[PDB]
Write a protein that binds this DNA or RNA. Structure first.
Ligand SMILES: N[C@@H](CC(=O)O)C(=O)O
Ligand SMILES: [Mg+2]
Ligand SMILES: [Mg+2]
Ligand SMILES: [Mg+2]
Ligand SMILES: [Mg+2]
Ligand SMILES: [Mg+2]
Ligand SMILES: [Mg+2]
Ligand SMILES: [Mg+2]
Ligand SMILES: [Mg+2]
Ligand SMILES: [Mg+2]
Ligand SMILES: [Mg+2]
Ligand SMILES: [Mg+2]
Ligand SMILES: [Mg+2]
Ligand SMILES: [Mg+2]
Ligand SMILES: [Mg+2]
Ligand SMILES: [Mg+2]
Ligand SMILES: [Mg+2]
Ligand SMILES: [Mg+2]
Ligand SMILES: [Mg+2]
Ligand SMILES: [Mg+2]
Ligand SMILES: [Mg+2]
Ligand SMILES: [Mg+2]
Ligand SMILES: [Mg+2]
Ligand SMILES: [Mg+2]
Ligand SMILES: [Mg+2]
Ligand SMILES: [Mg+2]
Ligand SMILES: [Mg+2]
Ligand SMILES: [Mg+2]
Lengths: 136, 386, 78
RNA sequence: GUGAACAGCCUCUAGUUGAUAGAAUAAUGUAGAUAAGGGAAGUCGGCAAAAUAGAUCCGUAACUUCGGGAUAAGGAUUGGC
RNA sequence: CUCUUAAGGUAGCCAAAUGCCUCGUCAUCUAAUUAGUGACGCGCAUGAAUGGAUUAACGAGAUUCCCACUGUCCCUAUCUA
RNA sequence: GCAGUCAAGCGUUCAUAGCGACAUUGCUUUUUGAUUCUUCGAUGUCGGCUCUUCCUAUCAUACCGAAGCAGAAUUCGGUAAGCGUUGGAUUGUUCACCCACUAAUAGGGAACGUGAGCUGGGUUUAGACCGUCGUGAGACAGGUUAGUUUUACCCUACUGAUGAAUGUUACCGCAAUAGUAAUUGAACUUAGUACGAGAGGAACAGUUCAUUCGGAUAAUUGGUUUUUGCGGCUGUCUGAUCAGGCAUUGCCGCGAAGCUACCAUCCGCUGGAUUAUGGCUGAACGCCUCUAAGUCAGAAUCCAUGCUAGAACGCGGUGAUUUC
């Protein structure tokens, strides 16, 4: 959430703590993301910051195009792989973890997004909705 | 030295001591402030917790992303057969608090209620109120003076009610007895209203209403002696800890040379009394009526009880109260339902609720069907069938 | 409220029941319970599981359902 | 008997049935285990546990004292009739 | 050029288990490293059988990084004797 | 380490918006010192982990005053310790330094809190290596590696748990006392508005959510398997089949009930009196002034409402009170 958040997000179960590595879903040339922080997270003793679908995280690319490595950059997750609950009572989960590299105010670095993206994420970030292939 | 890293307190200090409750029936310690204008009516009711189920309804909340869309919610049902009124009592103010001064009883007491006064019922000559009944048979001599006393004094009036335990599937046979404060005006009519209601019953509908926010008061579920970690949620010690790791490391500094009262310690867990507020009613059901689980949107004749009946309880052949969320206490425990103490707008407490669908699948497993007719339709004929 | 069909067992799924699994190819599967979810994870074939509807359809068991469709064979009379 | 095997497991001859017991199954323990998503972020430190593991076929680097490294690494198969 | 010694550290090597200042200076590994590695050396106080420098193979020796793995942890829960 | 008094100057002018030299008055024992009063027939001596409470010299949150406060942002100060103050790389580290989120990552005490609560990285015996010193035995808060961490059944404190005695027993009650709890942010709208020439750029009310904490619950999802419930599989044994034993629960899949998870769901109240401050009336002091009498409004403050126990020597109402 934050600057680009066009609306508010109901809490959904956190499945991505710090240190998690997720596939890169865009065409920016990066292949995976390494989470080191979560924007707008609280503080509690020994509580590891965690990310859920639709959040904005500060992350670095661990392996990929050299002009991207060794620097921090914002990212937005689009796939979780941990079951969470909508209002409908349906429990859903992808089969992997996926994120997209973006600037601090929500501009995507890529142009297209591979694989499905969560509805809560599309509804929260209009730009990834536009650049989104399939929305579930 | 100072604590290295700050951290919030563990546990809440407003609920000590964590000891077993005095009685299995939690006592209500506060009633809604009386208004001397409304008609005389009760302020609470008695019921037994049955179970929980799931509901689908259309949310009505302008502004939220799920305005006018279906959502699912978890609700719990309390079996509430009509109570029986037996006698009233009055309280007068004193510089040392409210004090009772006179109790009156109805002429005839049922067995299920007079069993409350015996610890060994089967060996007894059933000599209960057998001389009190002799106070009748004269016009009003021994009683009308008592009522005159209560009218002259006793600013606050409470009435005695008892549950119809035999109407429930329980194996209790011993009814529950409790006090409910009346809430009309001009106590003389309060006691009048009680007079003709002696030995008569009161349906829960006469007290509660749809979409009304209420309070649940009951004794929570017990678990026996419990370790400090699960009793208070404190951090677990590292693995390579000699002499146990399910403990608390430092139970106090050197000075003061005692362990403070604020340090988490092992002991009893559960069976405390708890008061939970702001619960919305979703459906007041009438027991002498099939299709309780039917809605205006579903329209299939089925009762509220699930397939195979509520686990550990049975059926709901009586009236019932259906409330959003969770209430303290486990199934088969007595529960008191109390009206709100204050006008709560909240833009939520006054939201009208209209159910779409009520789940009745078996809770004894991963039930797939809603009605035996549906099950037969889906599965076709079996070997058991002719 | 909409009722769906279990993608493995063919059972009906009432609201708030079972789970939903989205595969990498953006295909959507629904499951009524953990038994079916686990069997799908183990990658079993429904046609070889004796109690599923697809199996019975493939083996003509308990198939006393729909019979036929009658279309008249005569003049239209119109 | 299984099995490469005086490995581990079951049995035949032979020998024991000895170790204070009975009733319940709270906390904390000792020994044995399992956990969704993340995967060492805990900690001085991957301490403890887990992962690989038999046999047949393929493939096997730097370096070197030319003998080794080497089961390097990394893959495929294994029942019954 | 000069004082002084018997001679004035050569070949080599290094913030090394030997360097106080020192978390030396530069580069790499990481988002961030008093750690690790590669270089530089007026080296308090390295250095030649007091043995100097490498070295394939070997080590229940010490140390750094990577992959797989996992209740060490996020955050605890349950079962058996 | 922290706070004052005077005022040469800084601050476009102007001492005190904010700073403040030369001087000078104080407070603390969380630094390091001085002495050696208690302990050498022994008080277990660093740090890290976990846990409770207290202080204010206040980082944020509440309410206000001032500015070289146009708005935004920021600085100084007042009442205020209720609530919170993190996840990591390097080091045993206190400390220190960088990455990152956040409203904020404030300073300290409790025998430098805390080893019959843990660990033993360092220190701190005996082994060993290196450098310097010594002819030598050997020395080095110089470096490195390996090095046994004991006992609770007593009394007290605490968490829970019984219990004689008040004619007996049972039911329904009152409330002295003790404890107390909720906290913070974001988005939309207000509003591209107020202000400002412009660049920039708010706030009150309203709506939806979210962070930390707490009390419950299991309808749904997940976990746990001795339901040894069902099926399958390996070796061996019962002549074979069927049906079974053994392999310290043989292994694999599913697996009801119970327990359980911010890994699931629900819930967390409104009145009064005040602090700082701004005022009214009005003398002292024929004027003037919030003050002297009197009085109004006011904070996450205090006390109530509400919530948890219920004095086992605090109390009330009611039923029944034994015969050979
Ligand atoms: N007790 C010692 C130390 C003196 O001073
Ligand atoms: Mg920690
Ligand atoms: Mg502190
Ligand atoms: Mg809990
Ligand atoms: Mg140990
Ligand atoms: Mg069930
Ligand atoms: Mg399950
Ligand atoms: Mg053989
Ligand atoms: Mg053998
Ligand atoms: Mg013995
Ligand atoms: Mg083969
Ligand atoms: Mg030497
Ligand atoms: Mg001394
Ligand atoms: Mg001494
Ligand atoms: Mg002594
Ligand atoms: Mg001692
Ligand atoms: Mg102060
Ligand atoms: Mg750490
Ligand atoms: Mg001190
Ligand atoms: Mg301590
Ligand atoms: Mg101690
Ligand atoms: Mg030594
Ligand atoms: Mg010498
Ligand atoms: Mg020494
Ligand atoms: Mg002990
Ligand atoms: Mg009080
Ligand atoms: Mg279960
Ligand atoms: Mg005036």
């Amino acid at each position: 959430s934050g600057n680009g958040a066009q609306g508010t997000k109901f809490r959904i179960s956190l499945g991505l703590p710090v240190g998690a590595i997720m596939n890169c879903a865009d065409n920016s040339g990066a292949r995976n993301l390494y989470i080191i922080a979560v924007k707008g997270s609280g503080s509690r003793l020994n509580r590891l910051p965690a990310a859920s679908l639709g959040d904005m995280v500060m992350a670095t690319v661990k392996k990929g195009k050299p002009e991207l490595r060794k620097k921090v950059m914002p990212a937005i997750v689009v796939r979780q792989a941990k079951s969470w609950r909508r209002r409908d009572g349906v429990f859903l989960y992808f089969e992997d973890n996926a994120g997209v590299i973006a600037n601090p105010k929500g501009e995507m670095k890529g142009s297209a997004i591979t694989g499905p993206v969560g509805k809560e994420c599309a509804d929260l970030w209009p730009r990834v909705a536009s650049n989104s292939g399939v929305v579930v | 030295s100072h604590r290295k890293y700050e951290a919030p307190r563990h546990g809440h200090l407003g609920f000590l001591p964590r000891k077993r409750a005095a009685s299995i029936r939690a006592r209500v310690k506060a009633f809604p402030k009386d208004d001397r204008s409304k008609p005389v009516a009760l302020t609470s009711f008695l019921g037994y917790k049955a179970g929980m189920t799931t509901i689908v309804r259309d949310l009505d909340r302008p502004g939220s992303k799920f305005h006018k869309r279906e959502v699912v919610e978890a609700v719990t049902v309390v079996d509430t057969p009509p109570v029986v009124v037996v006698g009233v009592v009055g309280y007068v103010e004193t510089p040392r608090g409210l004090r009772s001064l006179t109790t009156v009883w109805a002429e005839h007491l049922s067995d299920e209620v007079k069993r409350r006064f015996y610890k060994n019922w089967y060996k007894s000559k059933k000599k209960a109120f057998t001389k009190y009944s002799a106070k009748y048979a004269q016009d009003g001599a021994g009683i009308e003076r008592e009522l005159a006393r209560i009218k002259k004094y006793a600013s606050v009036v409470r009435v005695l009610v008892h549950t119809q335990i035999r109407k429930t599937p329980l194996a209790q046979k011993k009814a529950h007895l409790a006090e409910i404060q009346l809430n009309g005006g001009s106590i003389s009519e309060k006691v009048d209203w009680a007079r003709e209601h002696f030995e008569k019953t009161v349906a829960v509908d006469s007290v509660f209403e749809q979409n009304e926010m209420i309070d649940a008061i009951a004794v929570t579920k017990g678990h026996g002696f419990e370790g400090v970690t699960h009793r208070w949620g404190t951090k677990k010690l590292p693995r390579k800890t000699h002499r146990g790791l399910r403990k608390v490391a430092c139970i106090g500094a050197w000075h003061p040379a005692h362990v403070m009262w604020s340090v988490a310690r092992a002991g009893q867990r559960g069976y405390h009394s708890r008061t939970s507020i702001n619960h919305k009613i979703y459906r007041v059901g009438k027991g002498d009526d099939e299709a309780n689980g039917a809605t205006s949107f579903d329209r299939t004749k089925k009762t509220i009880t699930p397939m195979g009946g509520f686990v550990h309880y049975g059926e709901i052949k009586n009236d019932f109260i259906m409330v959003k969320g969770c209430i303290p206490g486990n199934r088969k425990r007595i529960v008191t339902l109390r009206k709100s103490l204050y006008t709560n707008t909240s833009r939520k407490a006054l939201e009208e609720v209209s159910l779409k669908w009520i789940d009745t699948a078996s809770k004894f497993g991963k039930g797939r069907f809603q009605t035996p007719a549906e099950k037969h339709a889906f599965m076709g004929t079996l070997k058991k069938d002719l | 409220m909409k009722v769906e069909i279990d993608s493995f067992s063919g059972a009906k799924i009432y609201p708030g029941r079972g789970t939903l699994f989205v595969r990498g190819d953006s295909k959507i599967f629904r499951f009524q319970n953990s038994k079916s979810a686990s069997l799908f994870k183990q990658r079993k074939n429904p046609r070889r599981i004796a109690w599923t509807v697809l199996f019975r359809k493939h083996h003509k068991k308990g198939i006393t359902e729909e019979v036929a469709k009658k279309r008249s064979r005569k003049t239209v009379k119109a």
